[PDB]
Structure formats: structure tokens, C-alpha cells
Design a protein around this ligand. Structure first.
Ligand code: MG
Lengths: 611, 165
């Protein structure tokens, strides 16, 4: 009999697109039991044998981890037992979809299984979820001989999906254990500390309702925003003085000159410089220079940069941007948007990707010229060995794509074209003026070739009126000498972009989990989003961070969180032990938990004052 | 020349810019019979100029009426700050300093600014350090204008220096 091969993707839409590619359009589709998921069937060849292919999908994570029974209630103390004593089991992430039964059913007469789940670690974790359901019901293996395979791919394109099939590998079980470990750590510590506080504060304060929570990652994230707040509140502005002079050119222009000394913080010394310059009527050219310098094209686009730009420029929250990008990836418009890599592999077909955009009105002429002239090599970046940079894989118009989806897509495409374009070359000109004893300079930039700044106009060199041409020894009439009195300014609240950078620097929120944590502290109302996507700490958010710090600074500082995640990654590489990392970490936090509870007074007092 | 030798020592000192009182000079000798200007200078460098120095500066040097100072003269540094740059931030790069120095001859205090870049001094220069001014120093609005050409660091240290006794 003809063998049947089951293939499983992460989402219904992914399964359909992949199947269209592999079947060369020879597809037969029928509805699954749940209505949401479809089944795609066709005949083909596998391992030099005629087989039936059966492609379907799940709907994201099949399971979520929860306790078995009674530990699920909030009123049920002791919360401290959730660290070591409480047993764990996998529960269906969405019971209404009845995902487990469906997998068992389609998986029962199948002989081989090929995993087509997304190739970040999350997709890999679901692989063994899928295998756990399907493996016990599969056809027995004679040798046994390999019957389980795993496809690796970074984009939903004909080239990448077909190539994946030709070189199938295996699922990484070491890496899989790390996700389980990550799930267990955040839940236990999170629920223990949270449920404790919800009861402790239950009905305690009139202005206090269930909004209180703690998280091993979400709390250090909030810590950053509150840290910025504290520096802002204690900032003390200082008055300083800047001397500036104006000179009239031969073309009747007001040239503004910059003080070489830039600024001064002494009132009397400020007056001194002004007195010795205010009566001077002539400014003498002491030096001139022209230097050709280059403003480099950007590094290849990474996940962190996408979220920052989406926030700063497109007004999209980190979570909002991620879901938009994943949908774009789903529809095959971009490569997988979860990668830390900023370096194109030598093998990567840059020209292939570039041709799809050669017909869009906004950048058609730029792309066409580059394919004839020949593409430039992208700057060498860092190769993390996970995926390529986020690159467009298919053409689109503003007609096909919706509001938010188009705006994000437009940037990703424009960014890519710049990385493969030429650098921007410009002239940096300067003139040095002497007024009395004091030195002044004026600077100006003139664009020679726009380069990538043509397709990225927001990074363009600002248009300035050309500097008057002159020689050493020339003199210009001083039109005005005034001294401006100003005050140094305090920092503003953290932008979403600044928070992302902070998290990246300190090594927390890895594997693209950064947008999840940021969205978390907003939903829990620990910060508010103000104009310019600024993160303003709420009353509750401030007290909590201050409270945590007084008891144990290590609860807020990213130091501890950074090390656990580094340990988890070592597990993933097989250079550390799953059980040993769990045991050591849980011991550390159980000790910290008991100390926290004892020193709870540190938190209660601030709550009384505020509420 | 029983103490005539002590007199000529004072004259040699002033030619070098050191303005010490007669009592201060005796204090820096090791014997009354064998005055050595070299030993006196060495000791004075490590002594508070308010203790052994004699006033040379005009009483009104800070008022602005005085526009020039003629060297040579040895002074003591009382305090240094970045006057170009803000108090809390201090050092960070996009400023040029621009140091302000409060100085004294032991009797009159004055204020100097680093008009041109003096690599020989920094924010970390210890209070009590002595400097020799030479040539003509311009004084604008009461501030001495110092540069590499008119200022020489002589060294010396004074521990636990109190700005105002
Ligand atoms: Mg996923």
C-alpha cells in the first residue's frame, strides 16, 4: 500500500501556502472537524518511495502549562509551595479548538511525519507537543528507521520551502527543554509573588482594587521606566550661557556663528567674554577646510531596530509591530521577523529578492538602476546563525496591504534597498572666525550623492544654504553680538525604543520575547503611553519598583534575569544541564522569596502613603 | 654679614617670583648660620602660602579696575572646577574646559580662567599646588587669563587644605 506522510505547520494560513508550493499547485483541500483547520492532500515522492502527502496545521501553541487541580485558585494558600511542592502538567492552550483530538485523528493512518513549524525556538517547542500527540498513533517503524523529520526555513517562498524539503534535519530536543524551563520559571515565581500580594492587599486600601502583579522579567522591565522617572524627579537644572555672533556676507546673508567654547556656567565669566567681544565690529577668517566624509548606509535590519522604528516613526507598540510582522511573514511578504542576525550570508540571493520591488512607483527607478549598475555588497554585520535579516520576499502595493501592514512593509522594503545601495557621500565644510580674542566656527554640509538617502529621505542630509566662498585673511562685518542665557534640561520618560535598547544591552527578553514583556507592563497599568510613545509610570508602578528595591535590589536589576536566560541558552546548545539549571535557580529564588515575605514592611508603608 | 645672607636670599627669591615674609624665610631654613635658597623653596612648596607668604597682590585685584598683572609671582591654588561645564554631569566630552581656579598669595585671593589649553593642569590638580606666573597676565573683569605661555606649574602639596580659615 501507498504510504501516507503527515506534515504539520504552525498556522492554517502557513499550511496552505506551503502546500501550494510543494504540490506545484496540485492540491485537494477539505474542512477539518474544528472548522478552523483544513487538510491539504496530494501524491508525491518521499525517500525514493511513492507516498501520499497530508498537510495540515495547528493554531499556535497547542499547550499551556498549568498545575494539576487545586493549586489553581487564588485563595488557596500556601503560595510558597508553588516553587517546589506543586506538580506540573500540560493543558490545552485553547480547549475550544480541541487541538489534541484533531492531531491524533489526522495522525493515525500516517506513516511518516515532517514538521513545518516556524523555525524560531517557539515553533520548535510546539514540534514536540505535536509529536507527543501523533507519535503514539503512528505506523510502527521497521528498523526502526528514521520516520520523523524536521524542515528548516526562514521564508514562505517557492525557493526556500522546496529547498527545506531537500535537506531535512531533526528537531533540537536540548533547545526544547529550555522553553519548558522558561515557561516554568516565569509562572512559578510570577504567581507566587503575585497571589501573595493580591491577598495581602485584599480590601486593604480604599483606592486599591487584582491589578497588582510580579514578573521575573516584567518587573525589571518596569524597573527601567521607574529608574528614569527617579532621575527625572531629582534632577536640578543649572543655568548656563552661550555666546553667539552674527556676521553679514557679501550676498547680504546673516551667518550664525557657533562659539568654540560652546557654553559657560559662571555668570561673571559669561559677562567677561561678552564685554571683550561686543564692541568688535569685524570677524576675521582664521582658517577654512573642506573634507569629503561619508554617512554610512545602515546595517541590515534586525528585530530590535524594527520595533524601535515602528514605535518612534510609525507609532506602533512593540507587540502591535510584532503581530503585524508575523502576519506579513505568514502571507510571504517578508522573511521570518524573529532574528538577531544583521549579516547576509554569502550564499543569499540578494538580486532575486530585489527584483520583486522593481515595479513599485515609490522605488522603481532606484531598484532598476541598481540591477543594471550592479548591486553593492551590504555592510558586514554579525551572524548569529539563526535566520537572515528581515528582508522583503515578495512584491506588494498599498492597494493589497492595509493601513498598518503597508506602512510597516514600506519601511522594511526601503530599509533593505538601502543596505544594498551605495553610501551617501557629502562635503563637510568649516570656516573659523576670530572675533576679538574669541574663536568662532560655522559648519555646513553639502550633498554630493544622495546614495541610500534617496530611498530613505528621513535620513537625508538637511538642506542648507551654501557657505560663502572665502579665503584665509578675509574679514566680515559683525552684525550682532548677544549672549543667550539658558538652563540645562532634565531627561524625558523612556520611549518604547529606549526601553528596547535597555533590554537588549542587559540581555533580557531574548528570542524576540521583548515585545511580550513590554506589552505586559502596559496592560497591567504599571506605565502609560504618552505622546511620542513615552512610558509614564503609574502610581502603582512606582511604589512597586521602589518597594522591591528596598527589600532586594536583585528583584529589579536585570542582572539576575540576564544570567538565567544566558543559562537557558546554554541548555539549548547542549552545554548545560536542564535539571541542574532549574534546581539551582529555584533554590536561589525560594531563598529570596522567604526573605521578601519577612521584609514585606518595605512594600506596605509606600502603599499606605499612596493609597 | 650675620643675617645679610638672609637678606640677599629674599632678593633672589623675589627675582624667581617667590614673595615670602621675613618670618616665613626664617621658618624655611634649617639653621640660622647657613641660608640656602634651594632648601627654602623646597620646603615652601609643601607649605601653605597663607602661613609663610607676604602680600604682593593689589587689594582690589578682583574689582575689575586692575587690567594687568606683572610677573614673576608664585601663587597657591585653593580650588578648581569646570566652569565651562555643568555641576552634576561634570567631565563629559562636548565641552572644552575652561577651568576656574581660585588662587591666593596668602593674603589676597583671586580668580583665574584657563583661557587657552593648559595640558599641565587638570580638574584633579591638588589644592595647595603652587604655580608661577610670568610675563604680563591680562585681567578682564577681575579674572586672570592664563595659558601655557604665562603659567608654570611648580608642584607641591598641602594636605587637607581648607579654602577659608
Ligand atoms: Mg511562534
Amino acid at each position: 500500500h501507498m504510504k501516507t506522510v503527515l506534515m504539520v505547520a504552525e498556522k492554517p494560513s502557513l499550511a496552505q501556502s506551503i502546500a501550494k508550493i510543494l504540490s506545484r499547485g496540485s492540491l485537494s483541500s477539505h474542512k477539518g472537524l474544528n472548522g478552523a483547520c483544513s487538510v491539504h492532500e496530494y501524491t508525491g515522492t518521499f525517500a525514493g518511495q511513492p507516498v501520499r502527502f497530508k498537510m495540515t496545521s495547528v493554531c499556535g501553541h497547542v499547550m499551556t502549562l498549568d498545575f494539576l487541580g487545586k493549586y489553581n485558585k487564588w485563595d488557596k494558600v500556601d503560595p510558597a509551595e508553588l516553587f517546589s511542592q506543586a506538580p506540573t502538567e500540560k493543558k490545552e492552550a485553547n480547549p475550544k479548538l480541541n487541538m489534541v483530538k484533531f492531531l491524533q485523528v489526522e495522525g493515525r493512518g500516517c506513516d511518516y511525519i515532517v514538521l513545518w513549524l516556524d523555525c524560531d525556538k517557539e515553533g520548535e517547542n510546539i514540534c514536540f507537543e505535536v509529536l507527543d500527540a501523533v507519535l503514539p498513533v503512528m505506523n510502527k517503524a521497521h528498523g526502526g528507521e528514521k520516520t520523523v523529520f524536521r524542515a528548516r526555513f526562514s521564508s514562505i517562498t517557492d525557493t526556500d520551502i522546496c529547498n527545506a524539503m531537500a535537506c531535512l534535519g531533526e528537531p533540537d530536543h536540548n533547545e526544547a527543554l529550555s522553553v519548558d524551563a522558561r515557561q516554568e520559571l516565569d509562572l512559578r515565581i510570577g504567581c507566587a509573588f503575585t497571589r501573595f500580594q493580591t491577598k495581602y492587599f485584599q480590601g486593604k486600601y480604599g483606592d486599591l482594587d487584582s491589578l497588582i502583579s510580579f514578573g521575573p522579567c516584567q518587573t525589571p522591565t518596569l524597573g527601567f521606566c521607574v529608574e528614569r522617572h527617579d532621575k527625572i524627579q531629582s534632577f536640578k537644572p543649572e543655568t548656563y550661557w552661550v555666546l553667539q555672533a552674527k556676521v553679514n556676507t557679501d550676498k547680504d546673508r546673516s551667518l550664525l556663528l557657533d562659539w568654540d567654547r560652546v557654553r559657560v556656567f559662571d555668570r561673571e565669566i559669561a559677562q567677561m567674554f561678552l564685554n571683550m567681544t561686543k564692541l568688535e565690529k569685524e570677524a576675521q577668517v582664521e582658517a577654512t577646510s573642506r573634507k569629503e566624509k561619508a554617512k554610512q548606509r545602515p546595517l541590515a535590519l534586525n528585530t530590535v531596530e524594527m520595533l524601535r522604528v515602528a514605535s518612534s516613526s510609525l507609532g506602533m507598540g512593540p507587540q502591535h509591530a510584532m503581530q503585524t510582522a508575523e502576519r506579513l511573514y505568514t502571507q510571504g511578504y517578508i522573511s521570518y521577523p524573529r532574528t538577531e542576525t544583521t549579516h547576509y550570508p554569502e550564499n543569499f540571493d540578494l538580486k532575486g529578492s530585489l527584483r520583486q520591488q522593481a515595479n513599485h512607483p515609490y522605488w522603481a527607478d532606484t531598484v532598476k538602476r541598481l540591477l543594471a549598475e550592479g548591486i553593492n555588497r551590504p555592510r558586514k554585520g554579525h551572524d548569529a546563525g539563526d535566520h537572515p535579516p528581515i528582508t522583503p520576499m515578495k512584491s506588494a502595493t498599498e492597494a493589497e496591504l492595509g493601513g498598518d501592514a503597508w506602512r510597516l512593509y514600506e519601511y522594511i522594503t526601503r530599509h533593505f534597498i538601502a543596505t544594498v545601495s551605495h553610501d551617501c557621500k557629502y562635503l563637510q565644510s568649516t570656516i573659523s572666525f576670530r572675533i576679538g580674542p574669541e574663536l568662532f566656527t560655522c559648519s555646513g554640509k553639502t550633498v554630493l550623492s544622495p546614495g541610500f538617502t534617496e530611498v530613505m529621505p528621513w535620513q537625508s542630509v538637511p538642506l542648507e544654504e551654501s557657505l560663502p566662498t572665502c579665503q584665509r585673511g578675509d574679514a566680515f562685518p559683525v552684525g550682532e553680538v548677544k549672549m543667550l542665557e539658558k538652563q540645562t534640561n532634565p531627561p524625558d520618560y523612556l520611549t518604547e525604543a529606549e526601553l528596547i535598547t535597555l533590554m537588549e544591552k542587559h540581555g533580557i527578553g531574548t528570542d524576540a520575547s521583548i515585545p511580550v514583556h513590554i506589552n505586559n507592563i502596559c496592560q497591567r497599568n504599571y506605565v502609560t503611553v504618552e505622546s511620542g510613545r513615552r512610558l509614564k509610570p503609574t502610581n502603582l508602578g512606582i511604589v512597586l519598583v521602589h518597594g522591591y528595591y528596598k527589600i532586594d535590589a536583585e528583584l529589579v536589576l536585570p542582572t539576575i534575569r540576564s544570567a538565567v536566560e544566558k543559562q537557558l541558552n546554554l541548555i539549548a546548545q547542549g552545554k548545560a544541564d536542564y535539571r541542574q539549571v532549574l534546581g539551582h535557580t529555584l533554590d536561589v529564588f525560594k531563598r529570596k522569596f522567604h526573605y521578601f515575605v519577612d521584609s514585606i514592611a518595605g512594600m506596605d508603608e509606600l502603599m499606605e502613603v499612596s493609597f | 654679614g650675620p643675617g645679610h645672607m638672609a637678606q640677599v636670599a629674599g632678593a633672589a627669591l623675589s627675582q624667581a617670583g617667590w614673595y615670602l615674609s621675613d618670618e616665613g624665610i626664617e621658618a624655611c631654613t634649617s639653621s640660622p648660620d647657613k641660608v640656602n635658597v634651594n632648601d627654602i623653596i623646597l620646603i615652601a612648596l609643601n607649605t601653605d602660602l597663607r602661613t609663610i607668604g607676604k602680600k604682593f597682590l593689589p587689594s582690589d585685584i578682583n574689582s575689575g579696575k586692575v587690567e594687568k598683572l606683572e610677573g614673576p609671582c608664585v601663587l597657591q591654588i585653593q580650588k578648581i572646577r569646570n566652569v565651562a561645564a555643568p555641576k552634576d554631569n561634570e567631565e563629559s566630552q562636548a565641552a572644552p574646559r575652561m577651568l576656574r581656579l581660585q588662587m591666593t598669595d596668602g593674603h589676597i585671593s583671586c580668580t583665574a580662567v584657563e583661557f587657552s589649553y593648559m595640558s599641565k593642569i587638570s580638574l584633579n590638580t591638588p589644592p595647595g599646588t603652587k604655580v608661577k606666573l610670568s610675563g604680563i597676565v591680562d585681567i578682564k573683569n577681575g579674572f586672570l587669563l592664563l595659558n601655557d605661555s604665562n603659567t608654570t606649574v611648580l608642584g607641591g602639596e598641602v594636605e587637607h587644605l581648607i579654602e577659608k580659615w
